[PDB]
Amino acid sequence: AYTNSFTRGVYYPDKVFRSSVLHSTQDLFLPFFSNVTWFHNPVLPFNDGVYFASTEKSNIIRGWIFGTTLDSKTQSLLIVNNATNVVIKVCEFQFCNDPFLGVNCTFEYVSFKNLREFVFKNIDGYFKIYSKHTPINLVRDLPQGFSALEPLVDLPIGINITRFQTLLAAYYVGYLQPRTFLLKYNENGTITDAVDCALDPLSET
Amino acid sequence: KCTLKSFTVEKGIYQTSNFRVQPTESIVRFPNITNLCPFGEVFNATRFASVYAWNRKRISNCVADYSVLYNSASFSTFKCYGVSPTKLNDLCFTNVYADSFVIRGDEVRQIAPGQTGKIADYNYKLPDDFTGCVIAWNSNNLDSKVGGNYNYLFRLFRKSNLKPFERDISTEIYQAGSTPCNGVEGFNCYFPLQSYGFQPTNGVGYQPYRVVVLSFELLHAPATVCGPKKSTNLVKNKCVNFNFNGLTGTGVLTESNKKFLPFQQFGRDIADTTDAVRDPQTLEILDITPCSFGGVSVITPGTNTSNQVAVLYQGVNCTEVNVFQTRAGCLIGAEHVNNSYECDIPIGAGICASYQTSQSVIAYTMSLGAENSVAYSNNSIAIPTNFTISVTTEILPVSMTKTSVDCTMYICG
Amino acid sequence: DSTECSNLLLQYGSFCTQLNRALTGIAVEQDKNTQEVFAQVKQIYKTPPIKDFGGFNFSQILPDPSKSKRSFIEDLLFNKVTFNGLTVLPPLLTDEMIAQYTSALLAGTITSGWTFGAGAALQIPFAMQMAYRFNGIGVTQNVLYENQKLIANQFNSAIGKIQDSLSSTASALGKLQDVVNQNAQALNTLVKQLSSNFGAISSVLNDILSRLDKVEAEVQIDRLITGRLQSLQTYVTQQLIRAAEIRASANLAATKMSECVLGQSKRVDFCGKGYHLMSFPQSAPHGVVFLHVTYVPAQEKNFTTAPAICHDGKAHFPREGVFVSNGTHWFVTQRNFYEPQIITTDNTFVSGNCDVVIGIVNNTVYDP
Amino acid sequence: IDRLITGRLQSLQTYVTQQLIRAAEIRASANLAATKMSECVLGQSKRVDFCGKGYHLMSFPQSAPHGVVFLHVTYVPAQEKNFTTAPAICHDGKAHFPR
Amino acid sequence: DSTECSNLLLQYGSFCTQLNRALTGIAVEQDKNTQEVFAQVKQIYKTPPI
Numbered sequence A: 001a002y003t004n005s006f007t008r009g010v011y012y013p014d015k016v017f018r019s020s021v022l023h024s025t026q027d028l029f030l031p032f033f034s035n036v037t038w039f040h041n042p043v044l045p046f047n048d049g050v051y052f053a054s055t056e057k058s059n060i061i062r063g064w065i066f067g068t069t070l071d072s073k074t075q076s077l078l079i080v081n082n083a084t085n086v087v088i089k090v091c092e093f094q095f096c097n098d099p100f101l102g103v104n105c106t107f108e109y110v111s112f113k114n115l116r117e118f119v120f121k122n123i124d125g126y127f128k129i130y131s132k133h134t135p136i137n138l139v140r141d142l143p144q145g146f147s148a149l150e151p152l153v154d155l156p157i158g159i160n161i162t163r164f165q166t167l168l169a170a171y172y173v174g175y176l177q178p179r180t181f182l183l184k185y186n187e188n189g190t191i192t193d194a195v196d197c198a199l200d201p202l203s204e205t
Numbered sequence B: 001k002c003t004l005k006s007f008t009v010e011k012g013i014y015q016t017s018n019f020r021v022q023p024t025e026s027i028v029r030f031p032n033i034t035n036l037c038p039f040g041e042v043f044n045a046t047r048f049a050s051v052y053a054w055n056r057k058r059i060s061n062c063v064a065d066y067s068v069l070y071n072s073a074s075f076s077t078f079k080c081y082g083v084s085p086t087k088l089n090d091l092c093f094t095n096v097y098a099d100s101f102v103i104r105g106d107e108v109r110q111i112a113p114g115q116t117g118k119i120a121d122y123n124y125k126l127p128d129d130f131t132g133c134v135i136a137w138n139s140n141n142l143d144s145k146v147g148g149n150y151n152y153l154f155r156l157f158r159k160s161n162l163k164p165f166e167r168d169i170s171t172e173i174y175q176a177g178s179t180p181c182n183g184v185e186g187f188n189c190y191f192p193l194q195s196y197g198f199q200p201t202n203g204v205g206y207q208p209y210r211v212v213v214l215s216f217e218l219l220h221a222p223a224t225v226c227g228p229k230k231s232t233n234l235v236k237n238k239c240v241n242f243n244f245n246g247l248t249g250t251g252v253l254t255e256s257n258k259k260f261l262p263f264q265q266f267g268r269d270i271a272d273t274t275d276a277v278r279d280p281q282t283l284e285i286l287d288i289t290p291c292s293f294g295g296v297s298v299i300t301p302g303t304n305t306s307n308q309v310a311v312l313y314q315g316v317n318c319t320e321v322n323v324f325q326t327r328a329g330c331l332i333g334a335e336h337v338n339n340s341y342e343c344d345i346p347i348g349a350g351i352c353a354s355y356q357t358s359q360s361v362i363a364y365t366m367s368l369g370a371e372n373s374v375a376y377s378n379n380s381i382a383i384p385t386n387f388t389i390s391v392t393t394e395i396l397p398v399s400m401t402k403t404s405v406d407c408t409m410y411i412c413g
Numbered sequence C: 001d002s003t004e005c006s007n008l009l010l011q012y013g014s015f016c017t018q019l020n021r022a023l024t025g026i027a028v029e030q031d032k033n034t035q036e037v038f039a040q041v042k043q044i045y046k047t048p049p050i051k052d053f054g055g056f057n058f059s060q061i062l063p064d065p066s067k068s069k070r071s072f073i074e075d076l077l078f079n080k081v082t083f084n085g086l087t088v089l090p091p092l093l094t095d096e097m098i099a100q101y102t103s104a105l106l107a108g109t110i111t112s113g114w115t116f117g118a119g120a121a122l123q124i125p126f127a128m129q130m131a132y133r134f135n136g137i138g139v140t141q142n143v144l145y146e147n148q149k150l151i152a153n154q155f156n157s158a159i160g161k162i163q164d165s166l167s168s169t170a171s172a173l174g175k176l177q178d179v180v181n182q183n184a185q186a187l188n189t190l191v192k193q194l195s196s197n198f199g200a201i202s203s204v205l206n207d208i209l210s211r212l213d214k215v216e217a218e219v220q221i222d223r224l225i226t227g228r229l230q231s232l233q234t235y236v237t238q239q240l241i242r243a244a245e246i247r248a249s250a251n252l253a254a255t256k257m258s259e260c261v262l263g264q265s266k267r268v269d270f271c272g273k274g275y276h277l278m279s280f281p282q283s284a285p286h287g288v289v290f291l292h293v294t295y296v297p298a299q300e301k302n303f304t305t306a307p308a309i310c311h312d313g314k315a316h317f318p319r320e321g322v323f324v325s326n327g328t329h330w331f332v333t334q335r336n337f338y339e340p341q342i343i344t345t346d347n348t349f350v351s352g353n354c355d356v357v358i359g360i361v362n363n364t365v366y367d368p
Numbered sequence D: 001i002d003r004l005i006t007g008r009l010q011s012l013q014t015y016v017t018q019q020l021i022r023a024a025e026i027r028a029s030a031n032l033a034a035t036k037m038s039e040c041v042l043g044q045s046k047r048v049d050f051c052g053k054g055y056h057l058m059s060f061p062q063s064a065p066h067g068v069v070f071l072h073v074t075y076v077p078a079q080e081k082n083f084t085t086a087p088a089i090c091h092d093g094k095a096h097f098p099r
Numbered sequence E: 001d002s003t004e005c006s007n008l009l010l011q012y013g014s015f016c017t018q019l020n021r022a023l024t025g026i027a028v029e030q031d032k033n034t035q036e037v038f039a040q041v042k043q044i045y046k047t048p049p050i
């Protein structure tokens, strides 16, 4: 199944404060009103980067795997919320080929009711994660509104990706594409609105 | 006079120079020093492995002082290849690998790029493109033992010499001649590895020496091992050169009310110029103001009347530079006067200057004219009883000088 | 402030001196433009304490003493219009000095009419000044004195509509806001051109000097010098072209000060539409506002007319005015306001006989 | 030589651009002087301050190097006295106005 | 229409946009010049047939 992404999936593009200003930026973004793929756990492409989100209350999703093969052959990312805290390792993992979590290594790191939303991208040997959490009322789809995702980590792993999969009650996947956006910063330095400059002729204006 | 290329100067105000404050000092800020590397585990170990099959330790994700590797009395010899001994404390690497082994005191010369003979060609071959350091010390007090230490071996025989870093561990009997080995030595069939047998009575050429080679790497990946976060005290309310986490500039730093979000580090103006920063050692926000500058203008009654002049530092506060603060800038060498007159030489923001009382340059608020309350009422009229015929002169430009340039004779000729 | 770049820039010679000489001419001209519009008054005229102007109410255009002592309308105008080696210089006349000039021009006009523009200000009662301005448009001055309360109420009401327009929208001041916007956009463009590479390895000048050896760094810096020098030559040429347009506008405003404020103009549409009576200056940011007062004719009726009339075989023509009929009777009237007079030997002049004039009509001409 | 060509051609383009901008200013001044010749030498202008200060009587042209000089002759009223005044006078119950 | 040239021309920054903006100002002024001269009449007046 598929659903409309609306104005969601915007994240802070850089570590810079700006205020009361409209900023034009070119980066990998989820295009406005594009379809996300909707799921109720296959291996998926990563492309240039991913927007990932879940309507949640069960707390069934706990983590992700990212890599070229997602296998015991070569270094790949494992990310898990290990009940107490978030834990990350880069390894050739020997776990079952359809991996799950119950109801060598080169690097290691340690950190419905709601919508939990995330963005993943890999640039010149750094792995970027951004996120937000919010209350919701809508059940079946991403709710029509706006809130920018803030960075979590910027990991110097030196290692690349082409595919990913989720570890575990319903979730949504979209792809980042190279886009120009106009971002509205308020007095307190938060992004509060955006225009996808390629969406339509009014947005281009 | 030099700006005008002339020995005679007419009455006026002339821009002759540009004023500029210069940075009084330099500052640096990086985060609090943390995650120091455990390099003591490499050099203080109880023993190492055989030089044909040397043992590797990994250092990653940490910061260090490397100057100890030659400033310590513990190390008898130190070398670096592709790197400078001081510059280690400024450099960064993806990983650091310590290759650890023992050799006899005669042999340390072999641990160099492009060498030939037993250690280079059968145990540890170094290429020209290497990047790292070699730490060597006498270990006759550590590795030598009564009856001779056999835990250290070196390769003497191979079918062909080592490639760069070729860690060939193979123990099979080399056949130098007619006897087939069948898993054992014989006449011209020999075991390819030899014991050192180190004893404490040995002479300095036959004493054991420990070696660590810090085999560094840099990849397409970023660095994980680095020098320390070199930092100064902070400065405020003075023009300084500055560096925050590697963002460099010059300006006056001051405390600010601007509330950054917790991940944000730097602030930018509407024209993308930086206008604020976070101090990484105490997470409060500083505004940046440019280091002060402006035009310098000289005010003169002209050399045909005096050599006296006043000077205007345009837009500058007198704090930065008789002395008088106008809204046009700090004005020096002019007397402020409470009278008002027609504007003689214009300074700006309602201020003019003239040369008057036995005389000096004076500065005053310009006068727009004498005031006049007209004698108006609902039944009074004024009528002129006489006239003056007035003759007035108006001058108008009508033409320029007509000019021609041969563009080819100007450029070339 | 890079020393290495600074020594390469010496190879380009006079260019940096002539960019400053060009901009200094622009700066001196902006004060000259302002002096020629506002400093048209020899003395700072001021209005009497009591305001006996025959029913006309200038309170919204005269100074507010509680305020720079701008008028109420000048305060609306001042509300509705709103560093890498670059500097902004102050104007010579402050906004408070500009407002003293518009106050003196206005006080001279209200208390003495056109006379302060030609010599000493001669006082005249304001309704008697407006009667002369009615003669100046070809309406007889008894038309003002017989309608003075109406003419004063129409003026006071028309001034109130200015306050409503200037309070309800900013869109009318678009010419002044456009000048503020153009100069801001030109300076922002000039600053943003410091981020461009112009073909160099980097736009940051210390970054080049860190990466490269002396002879290679010079080749990279000479690209930044070339592009940043072309960036300034583009800004200065655009400011020279833009200043010529502002000077043409200030020459027009200086002509409207003399001809519309210090006089009564005969020039059609020069001082607003209708027949010009008078106008008042109000100061605005970077500009001037003229409030132009005009007579507009309002309620026409049709009449039969004749070029001349016939009496004792003589042809009579009107001295001033035109012959008209209501259908049964013949009158002479002034041309710009219907006021019918009986036709007489002193409303008219004779020339020749009844045979020559095409469309002449027979009538009695009364002889007093 | 191409470095000298580049700088000398940019030097000469800068000169011609500022001469074009300066010629447009001198043409505005010449069009004003041609209007003052017509309206004040060949006529009596009623335009306030167009031809000297005071009420214009006549003006005379004199030539100057690269320009014109106008000698503007004006009437200036000189020695005022104040009087009581009225808009009209009342006689046989009828209002009279000055002709 | 070369992309290899277009990516080099971006390194000159604002020059291309401000040339297009200057010529657009020329073009909008020509319609203004024409209305200032000819659109001086409130109504489309007509002569009588006679």
Ligand SMILES: *[C@@H]1O[C@H](CO)[C@@H](O[C@@H]2O[C@H](CO)[C@@H](O)[C@H](O)[C@H]2NC(C)=O)[C@H](O)[C@H]1NC(C)=O
Residues within 6 Å of the ligand: C326, C327, C328, C329
């Ligand atoms: C044309 O004007 C004349 C004069 O105003 C009008 O004649 C007067 O009409 C009133 C009303 O009938 C009488 O009281 C006056 O005594 C008349 N005066 C004279 C001298 O006759 C005449 O009625 C008007 N005609 C039209 C068609 O309006």
Ligand SMILES: *[C@@H]1O[C@H](CO)[C@@H](O)[C@H](O)[C@H]1NC(C)=O
Residues within 6 Å of the ligand: A160, A161, A162, B220
């Ligand atoms: C991933 O990285 C390796 C090593 O840098 C490289 O050989 C490989 O081509 C990369 N694959 C992709 C899909 O980028």
Ligand SMILES: *[C@@H]1O[C@H](CO)[C@@H](O)[C@H](O)[C@H]1NC(C)=O
Residues within 6 Å of the ligand: B032, B280, B281, B282, B283
């Ligand atoms: C850095 O260290 C000092 C002294 O221990 C401490 O006061 C300060 O809070 C530390 N700053 C951060 C950002 O941890």
Ligand SMILES: *[C@@H]1O[C@H](CO)[C@@H](O)[C@H](O)[C@H]1NC(C)=O
Residues within 6 Å of the ligand: B317, B318, B319, B325
């Ligand atoms: C000039 O600087 C002093 C501080 O030395 C400050 O008190 C004063 O207000 C400043 N004046 C102006 C006009 O900036």
Ligand SMILES: *[C@@H]1O[C@H](CO)[C@@H](O)[C@H](O)[C@H]1NC(C)=O
Residues within 6 Å of the ligand: B336, B337, B338, B339
């Ligand atoms: C101007 O007035 C101030 C304050 O009264 C006084 O200190 C100063 O001496 C006066 N200067 C002149 C030249 O009048």
Ligand SMILES: *[C@@H]1O[C@H](CO)[C@@H](O)[C@H](O)[C@H]1NC(C)=O
Residues within 6 Å of the ligand: B385, B386, B387, B388, D079
């Ligand atoms: C008018 O002024 C002249 C000088 O310009 C003087 O000689 C003459 O007496 C004056 N006449 C009157 C009537 O005041």
Ligand SMILES: *[C@@H]1O[C@H](CO)[C@@H](O)[C@H](O)[C@H]1NC(C)=O
Residues within 6 Å of the ligand: C057, C059
């Ligand atoms: C003049 O007009 C203002 C604004 O309408 C009003 O407040 C004031 O009372 C009027 N003055 C007179 C004398 O009528």
Ligand SMILES: *[C@@H]1O[C@H](CO)[C@@H](O)[C@H](O)[C@H]1NC(C)=O
Residues within 6 Å of the ligand: C300, C301, C302
């Ligand atoms: C004048 O005459 C024309 C034609 O008869 C008519 O249309 C018009 O309504 C009349 N009245 C006025 C006030 O023009």
Ligand SMILES: *[C@@H]1O[C@H](CO)[C@@H](O)[C@H](O)[C@H]1NC(C)=O
Residues within 6 Å of the ligand: C358, C359, E050
């Ligand atoms: C006026 O014009 C009409 C035609 O429109 C004509 O019949 C009449 O004779 C003319 N009268 C005069 C006096 O010219």
Ligand SMILES: *[C@@H]1O[C@H](CO)[C@@H](O)[C@H](O)[C@H]1NC(C)=O
Residues within 6 Å of the ligand: C310, C362
């Ligand atoms: C006008 O008067 C003359 C002389 O009395 C007469 O001949 C002529 O017919 C009259 N015309 C009209 C139209 O009444």
Ligand SMILES: *[C@@H]1O[C@H](CO)[C@@H](O)[C@H](O)[C@H]1NC(C)=O
Residues within 6 Å of the ligand: B375, B382, D080, D081, D082
């Ligand atoms: C009469 O007019 C003169 C100016 O000509 C003026 O100074 C004087 O004040 C007026 N008279 C009165 C009583 O105000």
